[PDB]
Design a protein around this ligand. Sequence first.
Ligand code: NA
Ligand code: NA
Ligand code: NA
Ligand code: NA
Lengths: 278, 277, 281, 281
Amino acid sequence: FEVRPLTSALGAEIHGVRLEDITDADFAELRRLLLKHLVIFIPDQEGWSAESRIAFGRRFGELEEAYLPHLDGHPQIQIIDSEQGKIPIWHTDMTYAPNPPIGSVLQIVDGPAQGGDTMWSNQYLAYEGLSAPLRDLLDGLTAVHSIHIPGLDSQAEHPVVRVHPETGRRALFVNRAHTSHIAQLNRNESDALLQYLYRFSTSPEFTCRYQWRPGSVAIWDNRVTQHYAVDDYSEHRRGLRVVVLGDTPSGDKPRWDHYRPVPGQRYVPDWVNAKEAY
Amino acid sequence: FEVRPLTSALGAEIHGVRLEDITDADFAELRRLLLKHLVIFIPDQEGWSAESRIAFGRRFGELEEAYLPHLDGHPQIQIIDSEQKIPIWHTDMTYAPNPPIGSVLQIVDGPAQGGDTMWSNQYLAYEGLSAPLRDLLDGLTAVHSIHIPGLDSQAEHPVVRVHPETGRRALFVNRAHTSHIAQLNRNESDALLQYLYRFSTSPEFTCRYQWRPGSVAIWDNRVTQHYAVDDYSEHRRGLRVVVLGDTPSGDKPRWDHYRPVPGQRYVPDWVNAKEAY
Amino acid sequence: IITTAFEVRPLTSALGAEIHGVRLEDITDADFAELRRLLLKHLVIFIPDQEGWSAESRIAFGRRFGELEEHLPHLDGHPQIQIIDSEQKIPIWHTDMTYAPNPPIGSVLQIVDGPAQGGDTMWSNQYLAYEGLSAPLRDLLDGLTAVHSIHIPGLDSQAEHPVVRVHPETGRRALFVNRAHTSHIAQLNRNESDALLQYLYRFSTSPEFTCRYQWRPGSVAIWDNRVTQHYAVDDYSEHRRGLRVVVLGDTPSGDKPRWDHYRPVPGQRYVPDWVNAKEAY
Amino acid sequence: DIITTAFEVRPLTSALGAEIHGVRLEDITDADFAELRRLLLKHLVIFIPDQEGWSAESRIAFGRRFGELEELPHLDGHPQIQIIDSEQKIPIWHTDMTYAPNPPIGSVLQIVDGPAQGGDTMWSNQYLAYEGLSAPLRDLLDGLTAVHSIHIPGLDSQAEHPVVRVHPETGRRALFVNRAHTSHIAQLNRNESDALLQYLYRFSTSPEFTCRYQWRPGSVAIWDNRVTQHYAVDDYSEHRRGLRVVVLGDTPSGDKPRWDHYRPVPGQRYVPDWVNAKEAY
Ligand code: NA
Ligand code: NA
Ligand code: NA
Ligand code: NA
């Protein structure tokens, strides 16, 4: 294939591939490129059949499946629609679950000519760019990730530094959208450290920004990336997505116990957040 | 009386007063001193009778009353008891449409050290802002709210309150109960409130009081914040009467409320945990 | 602004557009006028495949916008053509030379040697940064100025500019502060200034207001320095070399300030609320 | 585990500070001094009221019981007795002279002229600041050092000290950074250092860790500079004058650092995440 990296950190556009009837050997090459580049982009795949899209995702693992919008007859193929909302926050998908997805395949099938880019960030570089004392600290910490909305209540505890199962490389595994707090620190220390990590981890030297064209497919490794959907458009935007499951996140056993507050202790954040959203 | 200011900003201890049978004229002098000093301290009032305490508070206005812990037989005398703590800067109940105008608190049991209370002067917090920022705040309001089981209340108050008696302008936001400024978007609101909260509780604007059993504090909740230091494990018990008055008043806002778009999500710029303790 | 003469591919909604079907070497007056309209519309424009552009043509092109800056490594025999060379980087959001009373009105940059990936440049739209502020905050900023400064050996300069400037050619208002060179807002005390500028710097470089350009062989970027910031991503180790011409002549103008400068008292000390180290690298 | 029963002692807060009654410094005995020194180890700052008229010779002899005294404005004929004068202020949390390799052990200060209210001094307990950190963070800090520095006309000094020092006389660990003079943590990059120090500065001066002293006529404060910060409240306009003796001799000591100094790459630029102005007052 013809491979054109987007940035030094991550991302590559792959020309010369046809997903519809991809061979097992050509798939192995895509998998190798995904381990190298973390998110890959396959242009010009308009018309990709539902059965082929599902078979492709299933090469990676079991697919998430019917209370959410999906293609007729294919609970595996989720519909993302701007009119149904938008996610301008850095996140790693569903890390509030005990077993977050290991990756996704997304194709924007309707969208504006400009606007609605998606950015991804390289969590290997976010960890490696920390100085050695902080890497050593984070290796021994875990964090609670959680969500609390109508119809979905979930929390999970994950290592702050995840060992990728295939590469063995260590990646930061916190994200602003779903991480609540570091379990072995008090909440105020947690807020200060997470605030630094969130901003550092999404430095432009660690990211790439993709402009969607008709027919473009993005495949990303959700074990070692965050992503961000830019909210700079008003046109209708629709995507088809398949979501892949795998093993639970793994890292070092924590080197300290959970922080234990005293009875009646009140968390007073050092930084203001409003009590009412919109 | 013998009046000893605690700091330049606010606070004064008053000797030579006995609250139990205080005269109307001596009460008028206490009120004058409260408008001058914002919080006043009256030592050595052990044994103050419930009837006299209630009568004293009622000189200032209607008293709050029974779901709260209170002295048996006297729903107007609230109980602050460590075994039943508030280490956050706050102005009392500003999530209410009509927050109290002040309180009278007597620590009757407490440790020899630990458990101080601090107050801050919200006149000086406003006056210490530069002119462009004072002008901005004069035209803003803020939503104050609380959302707990059994108590859901919000209220919209001017960011700059005009004290009814002095006519002097005071900042009227506080970290405990203020949610957001209504005419700004939430992110702008967070940034401005963060600055105001820290500036308003600068040591140059505060006083710190060490309680001796029997001491009484009287404060004007229209123009102060306060903070209960959580540095003790011994039993601490206070008796409190809480006074009501008029709704907070300031300028009509100079802009409409900020209106988000239908799908808009608030993404804070600064981390707060999703789980408390 | 009507811009129908060329094939135009916008990069993001906020700003940026790649212009096809134009050759800079022998550009006509009509085609230049269209490029200038595209710059007023899109704030930064990208002209691909201009390898070999002659020095005389590059200078004549720049001079169609205004007087060129002369001095700062430059192409031998052409003081007007400045050299940006990685061997001899700027990963901080900035608007060029705003510590000067007359910052440049824009630049033309061509990366002639660079890596196949790495070294992107981002730009931000200061019109949108201002328009995205709520009305009370726009009203406040309209009446404020800020000091921009630099103090290094051989270059000490400061200038006071409106926080909100009008673009002279469009009449539209834009934010005019940037993290690299703005020091403080003149009518606030320093602590208030720090808090408000910190908010503005991050808000103004939100991804909804930016574009990110990957340089390819022969690419030329032209940007309006009056209403943008930009940022050079520092994610590469290969040699990177650009030729730049800089158009002089901006005079940032806005409303008369509505308050006097903040006046400290004798002996007053600035204590920042947020830590910065006392030693850099 | 220090017994201090000889005098009447009135602690100021749970964290630190105690007012000592029934002792006259002028002709203090060896036994009474030993008790005051125990009270200082226990309470970190002690206050001796009603000592108007304390003679210069007795003040110096008292200081010398603790160690060698520092020897610019000073009492005539007594270079050891420094004059502090509001007309010739410091509303910033600081530990004295930590930019020096050997900061002072402690000081003895008497405000001899001042307002009836205004000009309080606060102290903070750096043992409690460290002990209040969670175990992972205490473990991190135990292995770090920080550069402390000052760069003013006539005084350029820097020193590297453990972030966590052991008090040589109690064996207890205390935080050893302060906002005024600490620059950066040496084993972190500057941005990480800024974030961690900002948290520590605010946490370490929490009201639960401090005391606030109102000076009265004749008041003497004695503090241990090894395990405190302090802060002079700037809420007064009248003349305020103090007499101060400074005890030299500290060598802040802690664990061997567990990591090397952070090494930037050539040409690396420090870009703070938080704004500070470029110009003070
Ligand atoms: Na996502
Ligand atoms: Na209260
Ligand atoms: Na530039
Ligand atoms: Na000092």
